[PDB]
Amino acid sequence: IVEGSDAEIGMSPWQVMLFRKSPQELLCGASLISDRWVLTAAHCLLYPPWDKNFTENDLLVRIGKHSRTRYERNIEKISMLEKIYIHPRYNWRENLDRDIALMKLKKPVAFSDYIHPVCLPDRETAASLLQAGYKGRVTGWGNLKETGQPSVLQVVNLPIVERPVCKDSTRIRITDNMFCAGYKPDEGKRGDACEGDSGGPFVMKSPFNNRWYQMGIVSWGEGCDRDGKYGFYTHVFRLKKWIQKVIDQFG
Amino acid sequence: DFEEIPEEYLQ
Amino acid sequence: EADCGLRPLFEKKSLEDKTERELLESYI
Numbered sequence: 001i002v003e004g005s006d007a008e009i010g011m012s013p014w015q016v017m018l019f020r021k022s023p024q025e026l027l028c029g030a031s032l033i034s035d036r037w038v039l040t041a042a043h044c045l046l047y048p049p050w051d052k053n054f055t056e057n058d059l060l061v062r063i064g065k066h067s068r069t070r071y072e073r074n075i076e077k078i079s080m081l082e083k084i085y086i087h088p089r090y091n092w093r094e095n096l097d098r099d100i101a102l103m104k105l106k107k108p109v110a111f112s113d114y115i116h117p118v119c120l121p122d123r124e125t126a127a128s129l130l131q132a133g134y135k136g137r138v139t140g141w142g143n144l145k146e147t148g149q150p151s152v153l154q155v156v157n158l159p160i161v162e163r164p165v166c167k168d169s170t171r172i173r174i175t176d177n178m179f180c181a182g183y184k185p186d187e188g189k190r191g192d193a194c195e196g197d198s199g200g201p202f203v204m205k206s207p208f209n210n211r212w213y214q215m216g217i218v219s220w221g222e223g224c225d226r227d228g229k230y231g232f233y234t235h236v237f238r239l240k241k242w243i244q245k246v247i248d249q250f251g
Numbered sequence: 252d253f254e255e256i257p258e259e260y261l262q
Numbered sequence: 263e264a265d266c267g268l269r270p271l272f273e274k275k276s277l278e279d280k281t282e283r284e285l286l287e288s289y290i
């Protein structure tokens with residue numbers, strides 16, 4: 001996260017770290033959506049241009065974390081993966097369209113003060129909140145700048161951007177399965193996700209029921225926090241039917 | 252630069 | 263499930279985090 005701040009303890013209890021077994025390193029962010037399911041970006045698991053194609057046994061999920069590097073004894077919980085599900089129409093070839101994956105844990109994780117699932121949006125909540133100017137929150141342990149790394153989980157609040165501005169900021173083809181967020185050059189404030197934040201959640205707190213909803217998944221951006229560029233997020237609600245089909249079929 | 256995790260998670 | 267999105271150390275205790283007000287103020 002670029003230009004963010006240290007998270008408060010328990011501020012993002014659904015935050016998940018995807019962790020490579022060997023070498024031991026941060027792979028990506030992710031989120032907890034129930035006691036057995038974790039949501040992330042497909043490109044965290046499959047990305048042929050970088051020779052990335054992880055299998056279940058390559059990875060661990062670490063939940064309840066604050067410190068990036070420490071083993072947080074008695075706080076974090078580490079889970080093995082039963083199965084990875086990548087969207088069948090995930091477009092790694094072109095523009096990361098439908099950049100979404102689910103991971104089922106081998107055993108359920110115990111909720112605690114530091115571990116708790118985020119809500120997924122219904123159509124109504126999505127329609128109410130996914131509006132230009134409305135701010136969401138992005139969290140992760142990714143790099144602090146484009147070209148170092150944080151001691152603890154970072155947080156930044158960012159405004160959703162008008163689709164035409166999103167489209168005009170890039171030569172990449174934008175789809176309805178993406179939205180973008182970030183400040184414009186003129187707005188003074190800044191901030192963005194960066195390398196290593198991929199797969200983490202973009203959340204909004206509903207003013208209707210005071211619950212946190214994951215509206216987006218950190219997906220892509222040209223650089224990190226560049227003037228005139230924006231962060232692009234997987235549109236979680238637009239892909240909810242697939243999410244439900246997977247959980248219903250393999251739950 | 253990551254602290255080693257309990258071996259049981261790697262087994 | 264029914265308890266999703268309510269944080270043990272915040273919503274569950276009626277405590278607010280330092281910047282959630284920024285989000286609310288943007289929901290115009």
Ligand SMILES: CC(C)[C@@H](NS(=O)(=O)Cc1ccccc1)C(=O)N1CCC[C@H]1C(=O)NCc1cc(Cl)ccc1CN
Nearest residue numbers: 043193194195198218219220221222223224231232233
């Ligand atoms: C063009 C995208 C697709 C790519 N950009 S990139 O890695 O920074 C390469 C790059 C750098 C500078 C100018 C143009 C391109 C990208 O974002 N990728 C390629 C594979 C993984 C993903 C990524 O890094 N996602 C993390 C991310 C997510 C968000 Cl929302 C914002 C910034 C970033 C960091 N680039």
Ligand SMILES: *[C@@H]1O[C@H](CO)[C@@H](O)[C@H](O)[C@H]1NC(C)=O
Nearest residue numbers: 046047048052053054055086
């Ligand atoms: C990635 O790995 C799987 C299984 O190891 C393989 O079958 C597949 O062809 C590989 N490439 C993909 C999914 O693009």
Ligand code: NA
Nearest residue numbers: 167168170171
């Ligand atoms: Na364009």
Ligand code: NA
Nearest residue numbers: 225226228229
């Ligand atoms: Na920018």
